[PDB]
Amino acid sequence: YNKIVSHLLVAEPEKIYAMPDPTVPDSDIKALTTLCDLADRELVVIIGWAKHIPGFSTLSLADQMSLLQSAWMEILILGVVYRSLSFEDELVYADDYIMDEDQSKLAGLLDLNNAILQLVKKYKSMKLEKEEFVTLKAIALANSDSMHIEDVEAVQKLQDVLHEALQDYEAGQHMEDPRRAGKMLMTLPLLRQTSTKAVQHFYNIPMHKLFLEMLE
Amino acid sequence: KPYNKIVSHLLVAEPEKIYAMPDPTVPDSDIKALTTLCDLADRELVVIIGWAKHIPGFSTLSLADQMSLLQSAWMEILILGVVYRSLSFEDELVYADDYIMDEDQSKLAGLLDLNNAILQLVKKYKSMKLEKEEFVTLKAIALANSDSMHIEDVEAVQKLQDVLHEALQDYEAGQHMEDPRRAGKMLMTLPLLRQTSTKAVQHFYNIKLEGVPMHKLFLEMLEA
Ligand SMILES: CC/C(=C(\c1ccc(O)cc1)c1ccc(OCCN(C)C)cc1)c1ccccc1
Ligand SMILES: CC/C(=C(\c1ccc(O)cc1)c1ccc(OCCN(C)C)cc1)c1ccccc1
């Protein structure tokens, strides 16, 4: 077994919940607010998780932040994609918040959710395992291509270590396909692309009580 | 060991130089630079379409899928081209032998942010010492792995990806045994290529929005 990959499994964060309020009228506003709150709570956990990635803490705090700033959305997206592998045309943002097509339209996330579903499809066909998922996650962070990195060589070494862990895992656990590690790496471009779409949509995406009182 | 068939075909199919040929009668300006790049791009894209037909297995996909792949990866192929041509240079982008943009030229063209992002790609490939054989293979892989949402025959496209991926892996095993993970490191550069290309396409349309390209037939229609 690969020590780094096994270590990554154990450092995997605990499940987080959306906890949507059932007495609140279902709406785009509710959905988006639920997702935003869920994301922020997942991110606090992600920041702590990173510190357990072998080598991450040896980087400067400036570089640690740069990597996290460049890859935070890719980590969130990869999480949802993974939790959705055993579902059909649905996204498990959380055990207590699974979105189907109709819910996506109502939240104005049809396009974006379908892109995320594109990722789920590829991973389904490859039968992505938990070991591969957590290693790819760490790789996405290490390979986030921030332009503000101070020690390029230290980040490259970080990438090389996680990359070796993945090929080592793939070499022993999947001899039926000697190109499986490469196929995993080839899914990163779509992850980066979908992550970019999500971030772009987040910005693109009031106080009626007080407002009505100001007019009164 | 002798290069496998795929890499051999790609090296032979590699297009001859293409010049930007900016109009000498037109004074320098942001509009000129952008007009020049657009014209070069269009001629390169014509050459790229013919080049793809020479990629083993591409002409076997339906014409709809051939189109989808090309419509998804055209900018990545063009960007990988400029990046490769700029490897032996420093802080300058070689769009063509007759069109090299340094920083001050980029600022004048309004392309500083985009060109700086393209130079980021150059920097990575320079440290890896990207070779021509790896370059032609990556262009082909970028085309097959473009991730279009309009693919009809997913398995056919997946097979094309595997054949090209194998060509790279085999090339690296025989040519760079000293680094058992060199093929993987090449593949890991694709995300930045996708990111920079998306950034370029978006900047292009923001340009045509606040205006862009000096249309030839335009003034003729008005003078007529
Ligand atoms: C796809 C759902 C989503 C987010 C999400 C994705 C995966 C996941 O596990 C949890 C949430 C999402 C929404 C908001 C968000 O904010 C981060 C910034 N904070 C500091 C305000 C992040 C992700 C989203 C992204 C762009 C526009 C609208 C919604
Ligand atoms: C970076 C230079 C560039 C182009 C380019 C890149 C690589 C290369 O080898 C040659 C040019 C560029 C400009 C226009 C363009 O148009 C394609 C669409 N046609 C059909 C109008 C493509 C690339 C560009 C891209 C977006 C905005 C401004 C300029």
Ligand SMILES: C[C@H](CCC(=O)O)[C@H]1CC[C@H]2[C@@H]3[C@H](O)C[C@@H]4C[C@H](O)CC[C@]4(C)[C@H]3C[C@H](O)[C@]12C
């Ligand atoms: C949610 C949390 C604060 C929790 C709290 O109220 O105590 C804050 C503190 C640090 C924040 C993060 C940092 O500002 C770094 C990143 C900045 C990006 O623009 C968004 C994600 C990003 C990763 C942030 C997510 C988030 O809003 C964080 C994680």
Ligand SMILES: C[C@H](CCC(=O)O)[C@H]1CC[C@H]2[C@@H]3[C@H](O)C[C@@H]4C[C@H](O)CC[C@]4(C)[C@H]3C[C@H](O)[C@]12C
């Ligand atoms: C330049 C050439 C025609 C030039 C001419 O002889 O007049 C045209 C004809 C078909 C065009 C292509 C097709 O419309 C398909 C693609 C559409 C994308 O938006 C740009 C690239 C794209 C790949 C196009 C590049 C280009 O503008 C093409 C290749």
